[PDB]
Amino acid sequence: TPPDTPTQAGPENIFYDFNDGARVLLPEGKWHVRLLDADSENILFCCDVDKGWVTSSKKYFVRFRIQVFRQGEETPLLDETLKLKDRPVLISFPTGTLGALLGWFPYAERFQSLHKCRLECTMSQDIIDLLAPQYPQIQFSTPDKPRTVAPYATYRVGLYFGGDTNNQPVDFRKVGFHRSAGYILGVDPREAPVRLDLSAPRVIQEPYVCIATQSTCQAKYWNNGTGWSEVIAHLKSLGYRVMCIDRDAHYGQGFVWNHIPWGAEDFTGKLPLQERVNLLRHASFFIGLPSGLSWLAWATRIPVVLISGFSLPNSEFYTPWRVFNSHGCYGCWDDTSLNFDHHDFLWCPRHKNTDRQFECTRLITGAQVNGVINKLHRSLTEQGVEATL
Amino acid sequence: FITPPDTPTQAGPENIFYDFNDGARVLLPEGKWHVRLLDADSENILFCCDVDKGWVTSSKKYFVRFRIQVFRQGEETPLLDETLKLKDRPVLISFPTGTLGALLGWFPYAERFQSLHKCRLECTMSQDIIDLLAPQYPQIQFSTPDKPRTVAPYATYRVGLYFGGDTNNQPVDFRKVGFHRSAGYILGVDPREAPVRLDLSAPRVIQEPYVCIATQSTCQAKYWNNGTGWSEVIAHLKSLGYRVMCIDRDAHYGQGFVWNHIPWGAEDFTGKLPLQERVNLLRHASFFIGLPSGLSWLAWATRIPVVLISGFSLPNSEFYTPWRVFNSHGCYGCWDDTSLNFDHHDFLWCPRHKNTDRQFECTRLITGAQVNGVINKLHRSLTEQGVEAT
Amino acid sequence: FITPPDTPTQAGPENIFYDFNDGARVLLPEGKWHVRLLDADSENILFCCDVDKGWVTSSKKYFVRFRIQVFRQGEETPLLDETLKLKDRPVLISFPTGTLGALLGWFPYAERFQSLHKCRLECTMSQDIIDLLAPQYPQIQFSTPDKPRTVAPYATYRVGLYFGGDTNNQPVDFRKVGFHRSAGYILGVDPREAPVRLDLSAPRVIQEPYVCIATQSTCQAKYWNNGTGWSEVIAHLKSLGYRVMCIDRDAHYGQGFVWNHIPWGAEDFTGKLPLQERVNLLRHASFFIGLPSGLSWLAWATRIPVVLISGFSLPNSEFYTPWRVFNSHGCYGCWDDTSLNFDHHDFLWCPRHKNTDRQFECTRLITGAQVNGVINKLHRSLTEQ
Ligand SMILES: Nc1ncnc2c1ncn2[C@@H]1O[C@H](COP(=O)(O)OP(=O)(O)O[C@H]2O[C@@H]([C@H](O)CO)[C@H](O)[C@@H](O)[C@H]2O)[C@@H](O)[C@H]1O
Ligand SMILES: Nc1ncnc2c1ncn2[C@@H]1O[C@H](COP(=O)(O)OP(=O)(O)O[C@H]2O[C@@H]([C@H](O)CO)[C@H](O)[C@@H](O)[C@H]2O)[C@@H](O)[C@H]1O
Ligand SMILES: Nc1ncnc2c1ncn2[C@@H]1O[C@H](COP(=O)(O)OP(=O)(O)O[C@H]2O[C@@H]([C@H](O)CO)[C@H](O)[C@@H](O)[C@H]2O)[C@@H](O)[C@H]1O
Ligand SMILES: [Fe+3]
Ligand SMILES: [Fe+3]
Ligand SMILES: [Fe+3]
8 A cells, every 4th residue: 555645745735756656645726737757758647636636547667757837837846757766665566476476576676776776575474585585685574564664666566457558568468477577667578587595405315306286277287187197107217206396285176176196296285485495406307387386496497397388488487398289279368358267267268168178288298298308308318407507 | 789689589370470578579460450468467458559560569678577469350369368488488688888886786686587587597798797797697698799699589678777767668767766776676576785796715915904995987976076085085094004095997087177086195006907806906905985986886795894975876876885975965966866867978967056166066065074984983893893893 | 843942952151052953053142243053074164154143043954963163253263162962961853743654664763863872862752652662662751742851952853754855854855765764864873764663472362364454545645546456355365264354543534525445345443543452463463465554664563574555656665575566557656756746735636647537547557466466475475484
């Protein structure tokens, strides 16, 4: 929540602010308020108002220029341009869902390095415990306990559906959900991994592989019947130990329930993320869904085989071991003509409650994934961990 | 699966051919005749008709002691008056192309039918079931559907499930008496259930106490669709000092995106093995936890305690077992409901709550704590009063 | 019938009163409560709501090991958390001012319920049935509906037939499992049928071999509506050297113009006698030929062969007997069909064929020759083994 009263004091009891876009609160009189884009000198908004609130429709980063006129005056009573250097800036991520935070957060550091501001970021505690030690320049906090109280500017990074163009410059479906943060903060949009504590010594001596079979919605699962079984068996035949590191061993809704695959070691449970990083680091590689554990595995600098058909290859971070099939329905989430249902586990634009439901992922056979795994294995044996990454 | 002789097997005087395959049949040459079919036991006139030529068959196909009367138009007495008499005659009982549970349920009635009428009985079924049963039932001749040895049988009876409330090929709807007892009703014998006789001579292989489980079936309604059920049960079994083994034919089975896998923690004894090996493994098991699939019937026949988990069928639809798990607070017993109809082509069949939040709800309401409570009772019963407890 | 206490019998802490008569009841005083009802066996949350002062009852009335939880509307832990526990507690089982075969069929499940939970059980029924059963069941206290001796019972269960596919007072529709097994389902015990224990000590009075029959029924459907059935059967019985004796309560019974009388040739042992005398006569009988009426259940409990003639109910609707007579070529099982509904006010009830040519075809197809065939098998079985 933004402050009820704007944080900056202007002359003649006018209060201005940049917390939820560019805001300005006028007392009593007859005013003519003008919002400009300082970079392009375009007049973004302009109106005659007597008292009420005036906010910009755009909420993402824009170097706003606020002008407050008297209704007939030549020069401005107030004329303040956004300037963030050595100022209290608050970046608010939503209550934590991994992966999304790992994807977004590297854009928050770029925002701080660019504008040289005093930055505080609000997120769930576990992500703070994961990230905070490596980013000393940024102050971490939880949503319910923010330490700036009165911030100069606030920006709210998140996913905004329905083709929203007011809190984000472009629909995130067009540029990728994680880059979108870069666009919102107006920095270098190119993806990057977060910096983690990779100092933890190896525990398990034998070569082993980490896998993640669970996600938040069923579309993201690998809904091939014999997929995970064939993959795990093939991994074992190559001399790998296989370990599931999902948070839940069993997850699903109604009658559709997904369980940790037979043959995979049980490393599941609600553990602190640092332990997962430690285990993942010394793994030979990681085979995952588009869920967050794939982003965590990416940040630990190990090869990531990412199995997804419900999302396009360019929607997540790049990896040469991306598994994807293009002969059936695919990229259902990606399309801008469809809208994601938050209350439906089930929900297919084009085959829901039909014979072809979750075809996006069913066409991805074990043999395909095992073909990718064979390439990645030969790359690891012949060349080293240098060649992949 | 079964095709009656195109020409009736029994010869009647004036080139009339009569038969008791596919109900009571009679084929007349050309002429004028009045034909009557009677129930010899009740002396009721079942069918009255006038026909010049062609086929005359009874609408009822299940066992009835028929009495066929063929009359020349205007005659007082019958030309042919033959009543069904099965002693020392070729009788062919035809099961549907094989399934595991339905055959094990049905077949004991076939033996009663032979012991009652003292007839030469041949039964047609799939080969694996023949390999399982044949040695213990010497008096009955086993064959496959494509290679029947009795080319000209006196009477034929076709035991099976008949949906849509059929009352011509079965006396009662099988949903009213239980699918397996229906066979008894069709053959007109003692309908009370019984287990088949198996080869229980196999020596114990695994020394430690162990439990057999079956998680797979043909349609999703029969599965235990609780999220954490099988996991909690297997963990509880292990905590009691049991080894747990899955003996399903398939390790993975399902349709579309719905797929069921052998539960983590259970030993892999899956695969397409001969049934006799499954009998050998099941016999020395401490007890069995199963669905309403056939492996529960096979486990029942091996004289071990059977915990049967099902909500899509009523408790009285299968064989009796004190360890039957059932929940009556939600949807249940769709299978037994005579107002509904089973879909053979729909794997995700639940007629009343498909594609809703409450789909397969009745199965779900069966929690791991309920089944573990039954397992606790059965465990204490076994430790305290051994295997002599009924 | 029977009324539950207007105020729950068990005291809870903050003037909360809970109870297990008529399902799980709880009565809250004034305040702001959040009440949950759970199934202790499955740990499922059966019911859950926020209520200010009033009654909260479970929709299910049959036996469930309920668990009642009463919350403050913001509390973490329960103010009251009580699970059903019946050992050494006052439990009341109420049968209707019941019919004869229904009570004989049901009552064995009441004894199982007591032996399982080790409770102090009182059963309410009509006096004649009490006189019949009470001496053999000392562990259970018998009473009449109007004079119950447990004024404040811990749990109450009401065994009966509930039509219209009711699933709140009985777990399953009784047409699906059989009317008498339903009791077992209601009390959550072994549903398998059993005969009550009677006084079978009475000495033989009639020397010659004899047969007991019960012609009359309540509903015309249950009668043997074949024209010459009973006459042929009685004549055949006499030709086999049996004396034939009718033990129905009424010699004449029926409605409107449809009237049924004690068949000619059968001896008149009718009348409103105490059931114990009927038991005494039935015991030494060679066998019994009856309808689905109660006297067939009484004859069953006296451990004599029972030929049961019925078409309006399926063979599995009553107790098992190898001498069951049934015809499957016409209308049958008017009674077991879940798509139909029994009319208590209609004596001439057949839903599918009333006022047609085929009315009570259910039983008319059952000829005397059929029943005499069964009797011939049973007679040879008696003379030989
Ligand atoms: N404490 C933990 N300890 C150990 N493991 C844990 C822990 N917590 C979660 N997991 C595990 O990761 C998954 C959650 O993924 P998350 O919420 O972060 O994903 P979310 O669905 O919101 O979006 C996903 O879906 C992707 C999709 O492509 C968007 O269109 C997004 O790009 C990205 O945000 C990704 O996430 C869980 O299912 C667990 O298995
Ligand atoms: N060689 C084998 N070695 C080891 N296991 C084997 C072998 N072969 C099959 N199975 C396994 O048996 C089950 C399927 O058979 P099944 O006939 O039982 O089941 P189906 O789905 O057709 O429904 C059932 O439904 C039951 C009915 O619903 C009772 O309520 C029927 O009584 C039963 O006969 C059958 O109708 C699966 O679990 C197979 O992997
Ligand atoms: N004082 C007496 N002294 C001696 N005998 C007596 C005396 N009084 C009555 N009978 C005699 O028992 C019968 C009473 O009817 P009843 O309860 O039996 O039948 P009701 O129609 O209510 O339904 C019945 O329906 C039967 C049916 O088979 C269920 O589908 C049930 O099995 C049966 O338990 C009951 O449901 C009378 O018809 C008499 O002959
Ligand atoms: Fe899709
Ligand atoms: Fe259902
Ligand atoms: Fe009828």
